């Protein structure tokens with residue numbers, strides 16, 4: 001329903017209590033997905049499901065500053081399944097992004113980029129059919 005890669009503007013950046021919801025379906029035989037919360041060219045929060053990294057499924061999270069990736073954070077809980085519909089919810093909290101998939105808490109990612117009100121775009125990329133991408137305040 002939406003064209004991938006998709007850019008969702010986040011007007012005025014993010015703020016605690018802001019909830020971002022992504023609905024879509026993973027393609028058959030998917031290889032990768034990425035969500036990129038961006039501050040200009042920097043990536044404040046990269047959330048990257050990998051379906052086949054050495055025959056393991058893993059989510060890699062990181063930050064990109066001045067074109068350099070930092071220290072990866074890895075989660076081996078892997079809630080996505082090729083061919084199936086999913087919901088990703090990203091709740092901005094004071095100290096971290098809090099991510100739930102299909103209504104189950106998955107991970108938290110501490111804020112490395114601290115100018116939250118400059119994290120003004122979300123890019124959505126990879127091997128999905130994207131149904132919708134939106135935000136609200138809770």
Ligand SMILES: OC[C@H]1O[C@@H](S[C@@H]2O[C@H](CO)[C@@H](O)[C@H](O)[C@H]2O)[C@H](O)[C@@H](n2cc(-c3ccc(F)cc3)nn2)[C@H]1O
Pocket residue numbers: 032033034046048060061062069070072125126127
């Ligand atoms: O850190 C995180 C980054 O990781 C690297 S790979 C990394 O490379 C290190 C040096 O060789 C190595 O040391 C680490 O082991 C290994 O993980 C990815 O290319 C990076 N990426 C992934 C994507 C991407 C684009 C579109 C999509 F739909 C899905 C994903 N765009 N950029 C990024 O995910």
Ligand SMILES: [Cl-]
Pocket residue numbers: 032048050
């Ligand atoms: Cl990747």
